[PDB]
Ligand binder design. Structure first.
Ligand SMILES: *[C@@H]1O[C@H](CO)[C@@H](O[C@@H]2O[C@H](CO)[C@@H](O[C@@H]3O[C@H](CO[C@H]4O[C@H](CO)[C@@H](O)[C@H](O)[C@@H]4O)[C@@H](O)[C@H](O[C@H]4O[C@H](CO)[C@@H](O)[C@H](O)[C@@H]4O)[C@@H]3O)[C@H](O)[C@H]2NC(C)=O)[C@H](O)[C@H]1NC(C)=O
Ligand SMILES: *[C@@H]1O[C@H](CO)[C@@H](O[C@@H]2O[C@H](CO)[C@@H](O[C@@H]3O[C@H](CO)[C@@H](O)[C@H](O[C@H]4O[C@H](CO)[C@@H](O)[C@H](O)[C@@H]4O)[C@@H]3O)[C@H](O)[C@H]2NC(C)=O)[C@H](O)[C@H]1NC(C)=O
Ligand SMILES: *[C@@H]1O[C@H](CO)[C@@H](O[C@@H]2O[C@H](CO)[C@@H](O[C@@H]3O[C@H](CO[C@H]4O[C@H](CO)[C@@H](O)[C@H](O)[C@@H]4O)[C@@H](O)[C@H](O)[C@@H]3O)[C@H](O)[C@H]2NC(C)=O)[C@H](O)[C@H]1NC(C)=O
Ligand SMILES: *[C@@H]1O[C@H](CO)[C@@H](O[C@@H]2O[C@H](CO)[C@@H](O[C@@H]3O[C@H](CO[C@H]4O[C@H](CO)[C@@H](O)[C@H](O)[C@@H]4O)[C@@H](O)[C@H](O)[C@@H]3O)[C@H](O)[C@H]2NC(C)=O)[C@H](O)[C@H]1NC(C)=O
Ligand SMILES: *[C@@H]1O[C@H](CO)[C@@H](O[C@@H]2O[C@H](CO)[C@@H](O)[C@H](O)[C@H]2NC(C)=O)[C@H](O)[C@H]1NC(C)=O
Ligand SMILES: *[C@@H]1O[C@H](CO)[C@@H](O[C@@H]2O[C@H](CO)[C@@H](O)[C@H](O)[C@H]2NC(C)=O)[C@H](O)[C@H]1NC(C)=O
Ligand SMILES: Cc1cc(-c2ccnc3cc(O)ccc23)ccc1O
Ligand SMILES: Cc1cc(-c2ccnc3cc(O)ccc23)ccc1O
Ligand SMILES: *[C@@H]1O[C@H](CO)[C@@H](O)[C@H](O)[C@H]1NC(C)=O
Ligand SMILES: *[C@@H]1O[C@H](CO)[C@@H](O)[C@H](O)[C@H]1NC(C)=O
Ligand SMILES: *[C@@H]1O[C@H](CO)[C@@H](O)[C@H](O)[C@H]1NC(C)=O
Ligand SMILES: *[C@@H]1O[C@H](CO)[C@@H](O)[C@H](O)[C@H]1NC(C)=O
Lengths: 750, 745
């Protein structure tokens, strides 16, 4: 049983997760098998040539973010003993210099987010097996750091080097004598205002170059930002990229470009991805000679090139966009304009592989929506944060191109996706969706939409499968609401409320029944407290109901018992979420009227005083029961009498102070038991049993006020007699008493 | 010391506040001199005589909401003995009928929210001194009560009756034989679909009639709603209001009206307030004969008469609006239309007293703003929830109002400075160069929640340079330039709550130099701006500022700076008297950082942080401090010599901390302290004052004989008010656990 690290197999080697454990030094208790050691985010202050003796087989060490809340102190040759060390991460350690005497075996070294101002031969030129070297974020807006000093030729000996990152340092010019093995060169935010013909000569293998944030566009910049003199653009010689024939990725975001030299791409016939966000290229977008030079470009980003003070009627798209034959995704966020006409996008209608058009955040008032029918492979039409109306820190993330999917994958997987969230569609006009292609995934979130749904509003796109109506003011009282969407599978009505935001609103949920393949319904935070004519939800198809943030406390304390069968008619339900419903006590017969099909039941974050364990008998398929964050005091002593199906039982954040004699005997079915953050002082001999034996494999106990006398010795031995039962976060399974033990782990005892 | 009630004399009266105290019966422990008794929101199940015995001096009893989680049981003549009882409130008691044998002395009776289906002579006909009778919400969507049965003439004997409310009951018609003393008749949501000539005949003293919600407009209704068949309008005879010559208030909201008979107002020359919200009067608003009949109307409400599925280009306002010579406020919310032209409001431009135009929630895309210059007395232009853009080109509770939103349209504090324009929740995503041209002189401007990302540079507001109160909350503003907003040289109040970057990314930096440039700036609210560094300038400065709200930022980071750059951050606010540093995740304030707060402070809030220690000695540097608020932290100890450190402190708030010991020195005495709040701490006991309030509820008191000391000190100081005694609870020993410390020996 490992301590303090969680050790485990990964692929065909063994790993030690040892992060975020308040460790003040490198433990000497790591398993002998461990080849990768993550000690990030701890309180470690020193590394000597002894910290790692006893582990000569280490391949990888992560020491990032040490220490927390002076700096990390590393003796010379601390690591040169470790002859197999390939990867060493030393990020955010406040290193004042490259540690000296690093092992020759290193293939990857990260020294991101330190105070290293000098890059010397002493430090790295020996590391001839480096493939990837990360030196970003060392000299940026720090009064200490005037400029980064790169010893002439320090990289020239690194003849296997493929990735060099020096982004977020002040370099003023591209350092000379870079090895010809370089594939990716990151020089973002380095104050390189001029790129000569000489800078990238010799880098005939280069596939990526990042020069973003040199002569930034600082208008409305979140972080400090220093334009070039007179907001001039980065200055790139005409022949700067002539020998970069392999370049696939070019990032020129935020270089204040007003014009792009088509000659830059003369010898760059493979360019795949071009980022030109945060420039001034409204003009170039209109004319755009450079566009004729990019027949293999797959991703173009031209976002946030808007002109301050301007809200032009029209977008002006060069006809040259038609030469981007390989284009898969065009990002045009934050151009900012009023109207989009059919003819404005004519050039793009013939791009055979154009699947994503991103027009988020342009505040467009009007779109001729029929224009989207003229594209053969459009799969993502992203129109969030426009003004359509009713129709009657982290260094390893991308700083300028927001990278998460535009549309949730679960929605887009159904087919063609249109996102009109955060527009002004305050009701669904009778022509809202005419001339749209066949939409499978529609997002109308957060439009202040107060439509009275009656069964006709969506008939021009009747094959929507995933409909996101969250954060609106919708009236779905009519039993015909949304029934024109006979193929609907997923409906999200999270955070819906009345167009008055007033306590008292009633609901009618009869529309649910009409759908024969509706699978997932999310009614979260609808503050549902009463239903009108009908008091039962019904569906033969539904598998998942999310009912969090409503008032089942009121529904089930009804005088007339009108809601005791409220979910029973969901005949195929397997997952049910009744969290955040302010439940104190569920009537016994209300609980028995939940569908017997359930496999997963969540009643977390209510205020349950008691639970009737005996009723689990009516749920022969239940695998997961979640009762976290309640006020429960006792556990039944005979659980195996009530279920042979339950695998996962979550009880953390309750008020349990006692485990029954033979709680976990037999229990039988359980694999995962979570009793963290309860009020246990100890565990019994009798609460532990066997002959048994339990099929248990995880037991969570952290955050209980354990009494570390000799009474707990029973538990400690049972721990060693069941190495197979994992107990995570041992460091947080903490004696609260007696005083001399208070605060230590129960595992450190005699 | 009164218990369980808080008894206070005020004016002639002496109150007993006795509500929300988990009382299972009427205490017999109430001072003989008490005249108002509020017992509302308790667990009381029965009222007898004896239940009020030897309490002739009761004027008023409130028994509402008894009991809580069939109910309140009242014996006949339970109140018969109380010969001065004027006012009796019995709301939400689940009464199945009017209690019998109520005292003749009653002038006000409320029986709202019960199950009274029968109004009988036996119940009320003897109460000949009733002025105000409330019977609303008794037969409302109860299957058991099909209809409210009103005994013929039951009210006719009530010849002093001024107010009758029967709203939210199924009457189907106005009951006959109503007394002529009636001034206010409330008949909302009563299913009265027809009003005859006879119903209101001879109500010559009537000043208010409410008929709202009869034949409701149920489209998009929050509550269950049953139109008339099929959605026909309330039916009001031509002569229904002919003898109502004193009518001032007429509420016809939600009666599905398509047309208004001008004859209705023939004999109603003093009508002041007319509510026509939630009808279908788009047509009538265009033609509007009835408008010629209302020369003294002051408030007209035509809100939410939109036609489903329409978004018409234009609003059509009849010329006859020009006949509303007395109009002070016009409410036209939710008509829903795209464009407002100068000529559309021509009829209103000559109304001499029109001070409020309310066009909230019309989703108007464009307004010819110059039209607002043609009004004499416009003080409130309310344009929230429209769709105005950047301009670039030159040119439940029954006693609340169910259909007319009652709070001020614009915060009084802002409107008091003068002419007020509210453009919150529009689409003004940046301030266009013509945004404010052709506006009148605005003193109060609201631009909240427009997704506005303007880079403020000193020129955006120069067409309205006399703004004194500017609300910019909930936007994405850049105020990095030292010149931001300086064109508003008279600015007194600036609200930047919830501003953040138009990317919503942890990392945004701030420059607050603009603040110094203002000569008259008084109140600055920077709450929830997540401020964690300032660039170049590390000090806020101002000779004028009185109030800085700095909640929901990162003073924990600012004050744990390696080079101590922010040790003087607020030093330079020389006039500061109120400062809010709540919700700044503070664990510890450096001693010299605390001493660098302005010595002018009278009110300092550091609540809801996580303070482990507070250096009491430093209060010496704050000779004006009256109020120190440290609620919701983790503090362990109080100094024992507080009077050494201040003679100014009047209010000290320490609830929700971890204090387990109260020094014998505390009450130094600190003659200054008037209000001490030690609720929700960890006190087990207190042991061996100009103080007037001491809060102790929610401490785990040990009720052994060790608390006897405190108990006596309580009786030796009646002047020291202790609220919520019933919640000052023994947690131990077991046999005491859960009892009030007052019930002990
Ligand atoms: C209204 O309610 C619906 C229904 O609950 C919500 O939508 C669901 O949101 C949940 C959780 O947010 C989504 O569940 C997540 O699915 C992710 C995608 O799964 C990938 O890999 C799995 C492997 O089985 C495949 O099934 C799938 O095809 C994908 O390739 C998972 O990554 C998530 O992982 C979970 O578990 C792991 C470890 O256990 C953790 O790392 C994660 O933190 C996480 O717990 C997760 O299962 C679910 O897919 C959604 N369903 C649908 C239909 O959209 C809405 O979000 C809710 N609306 C609002 C406003 O709240
Ligand atoms: C300028 O544009 C270029 C592209 O032209 C862009 O380069 C990309 O940088 C990002 C961010 O550093 C790289 O993304 C990483 O890729 C590696 C390797 O597969 C992964 O290790 C990373 O994943 C880790 O971190 C993620 C978030 O931090 C986690 O999601 C994950 O769990 C991992 O721990 C990450 O995806 C990307 O590889 C390059 N692109 C190429 C082709 O090399 C560059 O960032 C832009 N510059 C700026 C300043 O914005
Ligand atoms: C139909 O329109 C009617 C107006 O024509 C609405 O009438 C109003 O009904 C409300 C709520 O039931 C009453 O409000 C209560 O009134 C008194 C206030 O008395 C005095 O004290 C305050 C203190 O400042 C002062 O401001 C006032 O001017 C009063 O002098 C209190 O008991 C309550 O707090 C509450 O305000 C209105 O009084 C009543 N108006 C009139 C003139 O009587 C009617 O509610 C509408 N119908 C529906 C269903 O919405
Ligand atoms: C940003 O900070 C601002 C300043 O702190 C916030 O505005 C202040 O909000 C408080 C309430 O939180 C208001 O104080 C209340 O004022 C009312 C009205 O008082 C009236 O009667 C009193 C009697 O003394 C009289 O003195 C006044 O002049 C008024 O006529 C009181 O009834 C309350 O009990 C309380 O004192 C401030 O008035 C208000 N200040 C200003 C300048 O508007 C603002 O809300 C914050 N913004 C956000 C989004 O949180
Ligand atoms: C519909 O659009 C809304 C608004 O953009 C999306 O809501 C965002 O969703 C992501 C993922 O849950 C969150 O991280 C953001 O915080 C959300 N923003 C807001 C303002 O809510 C939503 O995900 C989109 N729906 C689908 C199915 O893609
Ligand atoms: C400006 O407009 C905003 C939005 O209407 C007002 O915000 C309301 O503020 C009150 C009191 O602070 C709250 O009870 C409401 O929740 C707010 N509504 C919203 C949507 O935020 C704000 O008060 C207005 N400012 C002024 C000066 O009147
Ligand atoms: C993308 C974007 C642009 C703008 C904007 C457009 C035009 N002129 C602007 C001027 C500014 O000073 C600030 C922002 C803008 C505003 C909000 C936005 O989200
Ligand atoms: C005041 C208002 C009106 C409307 C609306 C206008 C026109 N036709 C509508 C049709 C609907 O089914 C629902 C709402 C409307 C929507 C939101 C609103 O806030
Ligand atoms: C479009 O995509 C397909 C499939 O990836 C690819 O085979 C084809 O070359 C692409 N067409 C063009 C013109 O790039
Ligand atoms: C119930 O849902 C499951 C999805 O888990 C599916 O296998 C099964 O066929 C469903 N049954 C019905 C009747 O929809
Ligand atoms: C649980 O519920 C049933 C009623 O459904 C009751 O008979 C049984 O004894 C209860 N047990 C407990 C511990 O509540
Ligand atoms: C400081 O505030 C006080 C009290 O509000 C006021 O009298 C005075 O004029 C203010 N001083 C300045 C410079 O604005």
């Amino acid at each position: 049983r490992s301590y303090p690290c969680d050790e485990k197999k990964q692929n065909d080697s063994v790993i030690a997760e040892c992060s975020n454990r308040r460790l003040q030094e490198v433990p000497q208790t790591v398993g002998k098998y461990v080849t990768e050691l993550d000690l990030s985010d701890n309180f470690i202050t020193h590394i000597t040539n002894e910290s790692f003796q006893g582990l000569q087989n280490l391949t990888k060490i992560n020491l990032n973010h040490n220490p927390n809340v002076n700096g990390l102190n590393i003796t010379d040759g601390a690591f040169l003993n470790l002859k197999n060390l390939r990867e060493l991460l030393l990020e955010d350690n406040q290193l004042p210099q490259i540690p000296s005497g690093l092992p020759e075996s290193l293939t990857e070294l990260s020294l991101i987010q330190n105070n290293i101002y000098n890059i010397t031969k002493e430090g790295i030129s020996r590391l001839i097996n480096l493939k990837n070297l990360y030196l970003a974020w060392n000299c940026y807006f720090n009064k200490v750091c005037e400029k980064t000093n790169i010893e002439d030729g320090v990289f020239e000996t690194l003849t296997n080097l493929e990735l060099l990152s020096l982004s977020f340092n002040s370099l003023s010019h591209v350092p000379p004598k870079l090895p010809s093995s370089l594939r990716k060169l990151f020089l973002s935010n380095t104050q390189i205002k001029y790129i000569s013909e000489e800078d990238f000569k010799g880098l005939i293998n280069l596939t990526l170059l990042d020069l973003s944030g040199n002569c930034p566009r600082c208008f409305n910049a979140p972080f400090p930002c220093v334009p070039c003199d007179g907001g001039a653009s980065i200055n790139i010689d005409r022949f700067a990229f002539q020998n970069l024939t392999q370049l696939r990725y070019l990032n020129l975001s935020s270089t204040s470009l007003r014009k792009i030299n088509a000659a830059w791409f003369k010898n760059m016939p493979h360019l795949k991805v071009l980022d030109l966000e945060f420039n001034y290229l409204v003009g170039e977008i209109a004319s755009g000679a450079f566009l004729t030079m990019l027949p293999r470009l797959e991703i173009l980003d031209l976002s946030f090139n808007y002109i301050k003070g301007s809200y032009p009627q029209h977008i002006n798209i060069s006809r040259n966009f038609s030469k981007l034959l390989s284009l898969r995704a065009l990002h045009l966020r934050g151009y900012v304009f009023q109207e989009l006409r059919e003819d404005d996008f004519q050039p793009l209608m013939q791009l055979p592989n154009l699947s994503t058009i991103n027009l988020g955040i342009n505040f467009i008032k009007q779109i001729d929506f029929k224009l989207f029918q003229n594209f053969s492979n459009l799969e993502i039409i992203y129109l969030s944060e426009n003004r359509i109306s009713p129709l009657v820190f982290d260094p390893h993330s991308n700083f300028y191109h927001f990278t998460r999917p535009l549309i949730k994958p679960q929605c887009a997987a159904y087919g063609k996706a249109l996102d009109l969230s955060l527009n002004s569609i305050f009701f669904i006009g009778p022509n809202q969706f005419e001339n749209l292609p066949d939409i499978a995934c529609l997002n109308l979130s957060a439009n202040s939409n107060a439509q009275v749904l009656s069964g006709t509003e969506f008939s021009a796109i009747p094959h929507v499968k995933y409909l996101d109506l969250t954060n609106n003011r919708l009236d779905f009282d009519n039993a015909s609401a949304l029934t024109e969407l006979s193929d609907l599978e997923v409906l999200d009505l999270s955070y819906n409320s009345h167009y008055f935001r007033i306590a008292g609103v009633t609901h009618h949920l009869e529309f649910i029944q009409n759908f024969t393949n509706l699978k997932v319904l999310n009614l979260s935070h609808n503050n549902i407290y009463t239903l009108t004519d009908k008091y039962n939800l019904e569906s033969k198809s539904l598998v998942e109901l999310v009912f969090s943030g409503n008032r089942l406390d009121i529904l089930w304390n009804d005088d007339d018992n009108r809601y005791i069968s409220i979910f029973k008619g969901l005949k195929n339900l397997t997952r049910l979420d009744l969290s955040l419903n302010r439940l104190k006590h569920i009537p016994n017969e209300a609980f028995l009227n939940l569908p017997a099909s359930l496999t997963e039941l969540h009643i977390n974050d209510n205020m349950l005083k008691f639970f009737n364990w005996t009723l689990l008998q009516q749920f022969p398929r239940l695998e997961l029961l979640d009762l976290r964050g309640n006020k429960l005091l006792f556990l039944t002593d005979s659980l195996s009498d009530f279920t042979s199906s339950l695998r996962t039982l979550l009880l953390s954040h309750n008020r349990i102070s006692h485990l029954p004699s033979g709680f976990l005997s037999e229990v039988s079915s359980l694999k995962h038991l979570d009793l963290s953050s309860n009020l246990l002082k100890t565990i019994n001999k009798s609460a532990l049993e066997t002959k048994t034996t339990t099929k248990l494999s995880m037991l969570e106990l952290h955050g209980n006020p354990f009494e570390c006398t000799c009474d707990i010795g029973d538990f400690r031995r049972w721990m060693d007699e069941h190495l197979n039962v994992k107990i995570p976060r041992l460091v947080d399974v903490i004696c609260a008493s007696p005083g001399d033990q208070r605060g230590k782990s129960i595992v450190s005892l005699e």
